[model samples]
Target: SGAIYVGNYRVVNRHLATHNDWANLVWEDSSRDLLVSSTTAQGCDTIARCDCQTGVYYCSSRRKHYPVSFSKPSLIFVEASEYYPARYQSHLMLAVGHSEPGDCGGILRCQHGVVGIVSTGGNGLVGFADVRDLLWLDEE
Candidate 1:
């Protein structure tokens, strides 16, 4: 059966805390800020910044950053953070400059309505099926 493509996105947890576990503050590339995570976790994948001094964490959603006081607690603490240009089933054109192999590649644009399937494994190519009827997700 053919599958529907949604889009490409980056997800970040909003209210991640370490109540019983040892919490460590780490940097997140998506949010570009210090996020809270358990010591076992290597990097920060959450949206809130844990204040070790106050033993409290503040929620930073979108452009506004605020606290989570008992009187002003926030509901729905986590959500999908950002939406960029790229969507699924869209053409992913790359600008492979005059560089050599295993160097780097730059994304030129994401044309919507164009169909493409990415193979992160094997050859790492993008194309459509021969029949153009169904899309497969199997490794083979």
Candidate 2:
């Protein structure tokens, strides 16, 4: 079976440790939320496989509209050390102090929905990251 070759799984799931660092840097502003519709990624296109349709791709569309949907599990073993590096736990949800400077990724929905994305903030807070254990793989 040509499946589960993610380095011979570890009983559950295993992958994504390409020399892991988790979180440690907050300065990658790819120009704040600029997309009304995007598709200039043309040239030498290559994809191995495809098939899609996932959540939040519709629903009156939110992200700055607040409606919500995303989250799962995890127990208490907190080693959680978010000083000012971003990614792994990205900052662990906080959002405040305006979170400007490109506002990294930006995606904190609530009412118990997507409460993580805009990782790394300053002056007070604004740390978001745990994207629902990455969906074990997800939409869009």
Candidate 3:
């Protein structure tokens, strides 16, 4: 899909990456100092950052079935590394919240950093795409 829309979010740009075979980092319209990818030794706290230490919050379109509108919820990472099926065998799994396939593509935001991205979900915790393995999109 060359064009995408999440509620009122108009697509400006899309940058993404993968790890092994997992669809790990997904970002939209970001041209900042640092994106903080999976690669360590880039002068960033890779381990701690990837863990999403405290937690993350996201706003979802909640376009599930006959839904209404946006749904915002804060979530804690239950497991920094877990199974996500088919591919992306290892991904971030958040706990104690509700997520839907419609929530997919929602970028996880934290207090002082960019966390992960919403991808898959189940009856329990939510599965997230990793930022750690995100490759640089472009320059300029």
Candidate 4:
């Protein structure tokens, strides 16, 4: 389940098959006059589950979105760290699609730092730790 709000009041989703999902965030701002619509990875996906211990949910092959719509820049905040010591590959990896060629879209690697999964050819990889929050200093 996700949360929808406008100004200061929070609205409820009827869970209509056609209107309840991640990109629905786009539709919400249109009809209801809302700025922000937030949801977890699982909440966004049609069918997703979270690990009880890690509190992270992921999308599955059977539960992906189709004909997704986005009116504005969409952001996905996830808990990604490679310190778990149990999983070496990656806890979660997300890839966005775009029209540009190289480095056109964005890629998010949670838990696993750049070094964990680096390219062999040539690609700048940076690492950061203790990343509690990220704030852009200037307004673009």
Please give the RMSD to the true structure for each candidate, in Å. Answer: 21.9, 16.2, 12.1, 16.9
Candidate 3 residue-wise lDDT, 35-88, digit = tens: 222221122222114333445535364433221122232233332223221332
The number of clashing residue pairs in each candidate reads: 1, 7, 1, 4
Model 4: per-residue Cα lDDT over 38-120, one tens digit each: 33332211111211111111112223321211111123232232212222221222222221112211211233211011100
The global C-alpha lDDT for each of the candidates, from Candidate 1 onward, is: 0.19, 0.28, 0.36, 0.21
Clashing pairs in 1: 7-88
At residue 42, what lDDT does model 3 achieve?
Answer: 27
Judging by lDDT against the true structure, name the best candidate.
3
TM-score preference between candidates 3 and 4, better one: 3
- List clashing residue pairs in candidate 4: 80-110, 80-111, 81-111, 82-111
Cα misplacement distance, residue 70 of candidate 2 (Å): 19
Which tens-of-lDDT digit does each residue in 1-140 have in candidate 2?
A: 00111111211101111122113211122211111111223222111121111112111112243323333222212222332222233224343434434445444443334433444445544444433433322222
Better by lDDT, candidate 4 or 2: 2
**Which of the predicted structures, 1 or 3, would earn the higher lDDT when compared with the native?**
3
Q: Tens digits of per-residue lDDT for model 1 on 21-128?
A: 123333222221112223332322222222111111111112222221111111111122232222232212211112222211111111222122111111222111
The candidates, ranked best first by TM-score, are 3, 2, 4, 1
Could you tell me every candidate's TM-score relative to the true structure? 0.14, 0.20, 0.41, 0.15
Best by TM-score: 3
